Structure formats: C-alpha cells, structure tokens
C-alpha cells in the first residue's frame, strides 16, 4: 500500500537517466527504479522484447498465416535435388558435387540477412521484405528505371523522364548533387536503354589479414 | 593499437586479447563520404541503421558496431602491443605484446587458407588428445 | 512436479554457488554478490592482483589481496573510517 504509493514519478526518474527516452511508464513500479533505469539505460544493454504484457503467447500473428513454408538457399538449390524429390504437393547425386557445393562453392557463402547486435524479432515482423529491401537499395540507383516501371510509366525508349523538364527549371536533386542526366549535365548520346543518367563521383589495403590464396579442403 | 585503418587491437584488464573491425557498411560510407557530413549534413544510412537509432538509442548511438574479428585469452595483462611490419625480415607482419606479469607473444596473420586449415586440424588433435588417450586406454580395458 | 524440482535445484545451486537471484532479490543482496565476485576475481588471478598492486601503489602485493578479502565484507568501510 504505502510502498505502492511511495513511487516517484517517471519524469522524476528521467532526470537520473542519460538516455531518458527508453524509460517507460511501467518503470514507476520498478522495485528499484533508480537502479533499473541505470541498467536499462546502460550503453550496450538490449531492452527486453516487448511481447511481454501481451497474453497472446507471443504468436497469434495474422502475418504467421501468410508466411512462406521455406525457400532453399540458392547455393543448395543449385544441387538440383529440388527436381529430384518433389516436396510440394532415386535422383542419383555426386559426392563431389554436394561436397563442393558446401565447401568449394559455398565456403564464402553466408545468409544475406542475418541480424545485428540488438536486432530482436517482434511478432509482426517479417525479415523477408527487409531482405528484398536491403538488396533493392543495392541494385536500384537513381538515373535508371526498369523496363516494367518504364512500361507502366508509358515512357518510350530514348525519351527522358517527365521530371527532367521540371528538373531543368527547379534544378538537380538536392539529395544527388553528383547526379547526371542526358540532355542537361550529361551527354545525351550516352543515353542507353534503361539508364538515362548516372551519378559521377567526385571523390576520385589488404587489411593486414589478406589471405592472398583460398584453398578449401578436398573430399578425395 | 591499430593494425590498419579499419581494425583495432585491444587487451583487457582481465587478460583478453581481441581485435575488432569496422563493418563494410561503415567502410563504404567513410570511403565514399567526407567526415564533415557525418556530424551535420546529409549522409544516407540504410533503413535498418536509423530504426536501430530510434529503437535502441543507447547501443546504436554511434550508429555502427564492431563485428568481433579476433578474440583470445592470455591469462596475463597485456601492457604493450606493437605492430611490426616484419619480424627479422619475415614477410608476414606480426603484432607482439608484452604482458604486465611479464610475457611477450605474437599474433601472426596466416596467408592463404590451408595454413590455418592444417594448423586448425593440429590444434583440434591436441585439444582432446588427452581424451583420445583415455578412450584408447578404455577400450584396451574392455578387451582386458 | 517439474517446477517443484526446479525449486529444490534452486535451493541446491543457491547453497553451492551462494548468490543466485531467484525471483525477488534486493539490490543490497545482489550488488553484494557482484562486489564479492568482482573482488574475488581481482584477487583470484595473480595477474589482476599484480596489476591492482602497482596501480594502487601499495608497499606489498598481499596488502592488496587481503585488502580485497577485507573489502568483501560491508563493515570494512567503517573499519577504514575508524583508522
């Protein structure tokens, strides 16, 4: 009773904290709030996954209904057993082939997503969309437009995007000062296919561990 | 100390000898950008980094993290690391350390692979070698 | 039954290994375990013991060791105060 009503306000607790935004309303009933704020707000600690205080047993997810059953890592998919055995609703294989797939072909191979120091998987999360996202931030760059989005845009080949004219009056993108586009800052004769422009960088090892040779263990 | 631009040597008060490396995601950014734009100005960080800033501001405040590269435990407390481009004209540059309780030891980067493959297999042998002797000595007791 | 066994193993592991936070443990009880284990390792490794000896600058090293031993008990602060 008295101890329950003795609690300091969470904002009174914020001042003790160097990173006050992590502390939350429920920290008021922390039996040792001044300590718990220091631990929770300590540098490298990773806050408890928030699926607690929910009674849903951490997975009720509607998204769980729409998750793909599985996908082979493409290196293993090269092994062709996908066609040999149909998992969806005998296939003689070579020892050298499989062994080389894991070792010769797949030594340097690593899953593309993984996760980071403090990455924690909440129920509603799905990594796959973020994998295509990270891969997409990689492939796609300004000045280039795929033929699909080009067809939807109804832009014929050899013709500049509609924002090149408004970009002539307004100016180059503030975010891309080094961006070049045919007809304006960049040679129109170099206009080719899906690329109407490219960023021209103005910036222009061994890491003590350079192996200088790569030799995998041989099965034979 | 520094081995390189992107990697660091460090010891512990408790005797850990480790080496860390900045992630390639950071090396690309600093290689492709000027430092003046880091504090203020436009530097485009992938979506995950920012979400780690608002999600975990305490750990990711520095917006990158060292992936552990090498870790080791030498029961001494290392006083001085020195990175020598060559040890007695040897090609592979070593790093030699003197410990407080006194010791001097080295970490030699292994070129190629089957160097560390053969070394790794020998270390794996000598690791449980006492157990292999115990299992042989056990089987001979089963026969006797 | 299973949880009930985990209670008994809680009593046994707590007996052997001393401080193990069960469910509710006061910060005074737990922080004492922290201090005791940290000092325990500082004096336990001849390495870190040699280190603290020099950085502290004591005349002998066993002064630092038995210092940590004494520093394990709470009343040692008031003991130093009474010197």
């Amino acid at each position: 009773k008295r101890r329950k009503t003795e609690k300091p306000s969470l904002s009174q607790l914020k001042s003790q904290v160097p990173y006050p935004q992590i502390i939350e309303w429920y920290d008021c009933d922390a039996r040792y709030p001044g300590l718990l704020a220091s631990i929770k707000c300590t540098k490298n600690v990773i806050p408890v996954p928030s699926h607690w205080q929910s009674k849903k047993e951490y997975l009720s997810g509607r998204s769980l209904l729409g998750k793909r059953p599985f996908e082979l890592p493409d290196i293993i998919k090269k092994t062709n057993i996908e066609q040999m055995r149909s998992t969806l609703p005998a296939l003689d294989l070579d020892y050298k082939k499989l062994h080389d797939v894991f070792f010769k072909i797949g030594a340097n191979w690593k899953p593309d997503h993984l996760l980071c120091f403090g990455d924690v998987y909440y129920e509603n999360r799905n990594l796959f969309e973020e994998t295509n996202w990270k891969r997409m931030v990689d492939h796609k760059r300004p000045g280039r437009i795929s033929q699909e989005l080009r067809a939807i845009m109804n832009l014929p080949e050899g013709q500049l995007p509609p924002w090149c004219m408004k970009m002539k009056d307004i100016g180059l993108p503030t975010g891309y000062p080094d961006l070049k586009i045919a007809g304006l800052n960049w040679d129109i004769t170099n206009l080719k296919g899906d690329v109407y422009g490219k960023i021209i960088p103005n910036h222009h090892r061994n890491y003590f561990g350079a192996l200088i040779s790569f030799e995998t263990p041989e099965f034979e | 100390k520094f081995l390189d631009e992107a990697t660091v040597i460090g010891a512990d008060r408790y005797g850990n000898a480790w080496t860390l490396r900045s992630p390639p995601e950071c090396e690309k950014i600093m290689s492709n950008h000027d430092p003046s734009e880091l504090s203020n100005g436009a530097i485009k960080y992938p979506l995950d980094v920012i979400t780690l800033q608002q999600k975990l501001p305490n750990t990711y405040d520095c917006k990158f993290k060292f992936q552990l590269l090498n870790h080791f435990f030498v029961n001494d407390i290392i006083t001085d690391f020195h990175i020598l481009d060559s040890l007695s004209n040897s090609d592979r540059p070593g790093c030699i350390y003197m410990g407080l309780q006194g010791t001097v030891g080295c970490f030699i980067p292994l070129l190629s692979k089957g160097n560390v493959f053969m070394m790794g297999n020998i270390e794996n042998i000598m690791a449980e070698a006492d157990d292999t002797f115990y299992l042989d000595y056990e089987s001979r007791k089963k026969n006797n | 039954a299973e949880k009930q066994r985990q209670l008994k193993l809680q009593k046994i592991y707590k007996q052997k290994y001393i401080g193990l936070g069960d469910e509710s443990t006061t910060r005074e009880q737990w922080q004492r375990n922290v201090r005791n284990d940290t000092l325990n390792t500082l004096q336990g490794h001849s390495a870190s013991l040699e280190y603290v000896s020099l950085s502290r600058g004591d005349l002998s090293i066993r002064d630092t060791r038995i210092h940590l031993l004494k520093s394990m008990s709470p009343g040692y602060k008031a003991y130093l105060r009474e010197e």
Binding site: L211 | F72, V74, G99, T103, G105, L110 | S46
Partner: peptide
C-alpha cells in the same frame, strides 16, 4: 568475395615470469 576473417597465430615467446607457487620436494633422480 574475399573473406577478411583475420587468422592470428598466437605464440608465447617468453613465458610468464611472476612465480606464484613453489614446492620443496625431490621429484626426479
């Protein structure tokens, strides 16, 4: 892609000199 993965080879050149324990017995003849 080349894996960085620095492979370090630890050697103790000179062995720890602070002598923490001793015994007086006669071991080998």
């Amino acid at each position: 892609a080349k894996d960085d993965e620095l492979y370090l080879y630890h050697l103790t050149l000179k062995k720890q000199t602070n002598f923490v324990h001793s015994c007086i017995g006669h071991f080998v003849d």
